Design a protein around this ligand. Structure first.
Ligand SMILES: [K+]
Ligand SMILES: [Mg+2]
Ligand SMILES: [Mg+2]
Ligand SMILES: [Mg+2]
Ligand SMILES: [Mg+2]
Lengths: 55, 122, 107, 140, 94, 136, 45
């Protein structure tokens, strides 16, 4: 359920999970469905991160 | 049963009469090899086929440069009957950054850094 | 295949290029359709490409006849009288552009 | 829905058209012709290697024929033209031996002269200088 | 006349095979090339101790590139422009 | 020593035949597309690859291995200098080859596949073959 | 914001969406395999 420019969200996620992983995450960007798929488990980490931005 | 071969160490012991025959110098051994496969890996054991791949000798008559070190020499002594070994000579020295585009490996084993394609004026 | 097909010796038309080069291609006839997906590549070729192509080759007369048809075709007529008919049914702009240029080079 | 083949005629004519020049029933019967058209196509692919091989063999015979008219053998001509840095293939020499008889005789004289120079150099021990035509142009 | 029992080159009674003059020369030519290979393998530039550890960094970095390519395998991105570009099949003139 | 000056006499005589134009049609052997062509003026040669050149363009064939006439012949070692011979050709026709059948078949193995290829071709016409008096 | 709007204004210049110009999502419908041809015909797996 990602709306608007999804590619901006990927850059923020890449710049956010890189320190935790030590390397650039591998992500799939589906513009049609408006969903971001990220390799690896980041459920608890991203849920807290999205609450910070007020989503 | 047919198995691998343990080549005696005495085989790889150059005599003084060999240094005056092949032009090599035991005191100053060459730094790099020029290995070229001249025989088919077909009808040869599988371990010889694998070593050919490890040395990057897939295509025949394609010169390859390797380091004259015991570990690399160990692999060469296994397929020494399928390749031609020549020392790499540097009459002009090691190629620099400005001479990368002007290199040419002649059949004599020498790598020139100035390939002018021009008859000698001498 | 050779035995099952005819053959000819290498030759040109009136010794082309001996004194001057003459473009042997003489005429192009395009039959595109206003409606029909088969001419989608051909319609784009007519809108932007054939105009600039006619600029480069002034000696070739190009006819664009827009009529209903299921298979768009390009007909090339040459000075020696041979007529070559080709179909551009469902081809991209680049494939049509290369094909037309090939017809220009042939004798 | 029942689907039947309606264009089977066009599927068999694309094979029979390659067999029209054959002999017997294998030019009009699809069952017989298909086994012959396939072999004809296979022979077509494998004959591309023979054509290249046969052309070179034909050239060698023509080169050999012209060399004997000048009292030379084929190994004596090809071998001694290499040592003069004259890189002419069999195609050119065969054409020269047919359309340029005077030019071929000049090459035969050059090869014969170079052949004689090697024999003279083989008799000596290197003290005498090399032959005039035995010099090699070096490229750097 | 001159039948060889069974197959030619197999069995107890095989067709004799003889070595020609050029066959000997070809083998001698092969031996000379390999005899020279034994010479150039007898003069190592460095010993076993000196060689050790001289390429550990390059080998370690080379495998990390293989790991990066192996762990980067993922389905390609799906763009919304490509899905909409299929509607161009019905583009026509007015 | 005696033959060295004898060569100069022959070369000067042949060089003297070029300034006065005492020669007719010239045949030149050129190396193009990995092939040696025995070409003369106003003839055609078929080349089995594309030169990326528009038809009608006039080019020069740099590699000439042999230039011959009715009475004199010059040999390159292995190539003649650019100051001694100049061969120019013209691109007149660029077309695809006739369909070539590439079929492979193996008996009793259900191995059968057919391929048709059309290699690009280029036709060049030799316009002129001129030499210059630079032997001496 | 920009992503939602870019997906609608671009659709205006495209031809009319109809029953003809529709297609399934790529990769969502595998082609069916039939025991025909050289690849799948000699013994049909
Ligand atoms: K199979
Ligand atoms: Mg051959
Ligand atoms: Mg028997
Ligand atoms: Mg099968
Ligand atoms: Mg069957």
């Amino acid at each position: 359920k990602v709306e608007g420019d999804i590619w901006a969200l990927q850059k923020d996620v890449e710049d956010f999970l890189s320190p935790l992983l030590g390397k650039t995450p591998v992500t799939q960007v589906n513009e049609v469905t408006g969903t971001l798929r990220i390799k690896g488990y980041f459920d608890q980490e991203l849920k807290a991160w999205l609450l910070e931005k007020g989503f | 049963k047919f198995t691998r071969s343990r080549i005696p160490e005495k085989v790889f012991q150059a005599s003084p009469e060999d240094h005056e025959k092949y032009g090599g110098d035991p005191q100053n051994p060459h730094k790099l090899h020029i290995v070229t496969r001249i025989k088919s890996t077909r009808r040869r054991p599988y371990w010889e086929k694998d070593i050919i791949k490890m040395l990057g000798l897939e295509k025949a008559h394609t010169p390859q440069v390797h380091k004259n070190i015991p570990s690399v020499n160990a692999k060469l002594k296994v397929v020494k009957h399928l390749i031609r070994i020549k020392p790499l000579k540097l009459p002009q020295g090691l190629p620099a950054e400005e001479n990368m585009s002007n290199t040419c490996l002649k059949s004599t084993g020498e790598l020139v850094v100035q390939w002018h394609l021009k008859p000698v004026e001498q | 295949t050779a035995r099952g097909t005819p053959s000819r010796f290498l030759a040109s038309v009136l010794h082309n290029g001996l004194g001057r080069y003459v473009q042997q291609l003489q005429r192009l006839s395009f039959s595109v359709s206003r409606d029909g997906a088969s001419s989608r590549g051909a319609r784009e070729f007519v809108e932007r490409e054939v105009i600039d192509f006619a600029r480069r080759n002034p000696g070739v007369v190009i006819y664009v006849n827009s009529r209903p048809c299921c298979v768009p075709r390009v007909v090339a007529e040459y000075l020696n009288g041979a007529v070559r008919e080709e179909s551009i049914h469902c081809k991209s702009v680049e494939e049509i552009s290369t094909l037309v240029q090939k017809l220009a080079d042939q004798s | 829905l029942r689907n039947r083949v309606t264009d089977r005629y066009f599927r068999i004519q694309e094979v029979l058209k390659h067999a029209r020049h054959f002999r017997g029933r294998k030019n009009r019967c699809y069952r017989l012709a298909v086994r012959t058209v396939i072999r004809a196509f296979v022979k077509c692919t494998k004959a591309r290697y023979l054509k290249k091989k046969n052309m070179r063999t034909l050239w060698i015979n023509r080169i050999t024929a012209a060399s004997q008219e000048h009292g030379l053998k084929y190994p004596a001509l090809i071998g001694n033209l290499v040592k003069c840095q004259v890189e002419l293939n069999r195609k050119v020499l065969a054409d020269l031996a047919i359309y340029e008889p005077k030019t071929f005789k000049s090459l035969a004289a050059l090869a014969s002269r170079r052949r004689h120079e090697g024999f003279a150099a083989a008799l000596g021990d290197g003290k005498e200088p090399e032959g005039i035509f035995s010099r090699v142009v070096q490229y750097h | 006349r001159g039948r060889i029992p069974g197959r030619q080159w197999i069995g107890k009674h095989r067709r004799p095979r003889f070595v020609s003059l050029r066959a000997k020369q070809n083998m001698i030519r092969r031996l000379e090339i390999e005899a020279e290979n034994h010479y150039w393998l007898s003069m190592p530039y460095m010993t076993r101790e000196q060689e050790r550890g001289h390429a550990a960094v390059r080998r370690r970095e080379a495998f990390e590139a293989i790991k990066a390519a192996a762990t980067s395998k993922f389905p390609p991105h799906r763009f919304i422009a490509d899905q909409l570009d299929h509607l161009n099949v019905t583009k026509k003139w007015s | 020593v005696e033959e060295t000056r004898h060569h100069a006499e022959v070369v000067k005589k042949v060089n003297e035949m070029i300034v006065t134009g005492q020669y007719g049609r010239l045949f030149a052997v050129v190396h193009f597309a990995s092939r040696q062509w025995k070409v003369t003026s106003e003839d055609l040669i078929l080349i089995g690859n594309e030169l990326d050149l528009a038809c009608g363009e006039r080019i020069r064939l740099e590699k000439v291995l042999l230039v011959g006439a009715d009475n004199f012949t010059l040999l390159g070692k292995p190539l003649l200098g650019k100051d001694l011979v100049r061969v120019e050709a013209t691109v007149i026709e660029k077309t695809e080859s006739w369909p070539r059948i590439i079929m492979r078949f193996r008996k009793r193995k259900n191995f059968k596949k057919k391929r048709i290829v059309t290699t690009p071709q280029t036709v060049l016409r030799i316009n002129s073959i001129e030499i210059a008096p630079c032997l001496l | 914001q920009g992503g939602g709007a870019r997906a609608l204004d671009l659709l205006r210049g495209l031809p009319r969406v109809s029953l003809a110009n529709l297609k399934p999502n790529p990769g969502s419908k595998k082609p069916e395999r039939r025991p025909r041809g050289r690849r799948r015909g000699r013994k049909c797996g």
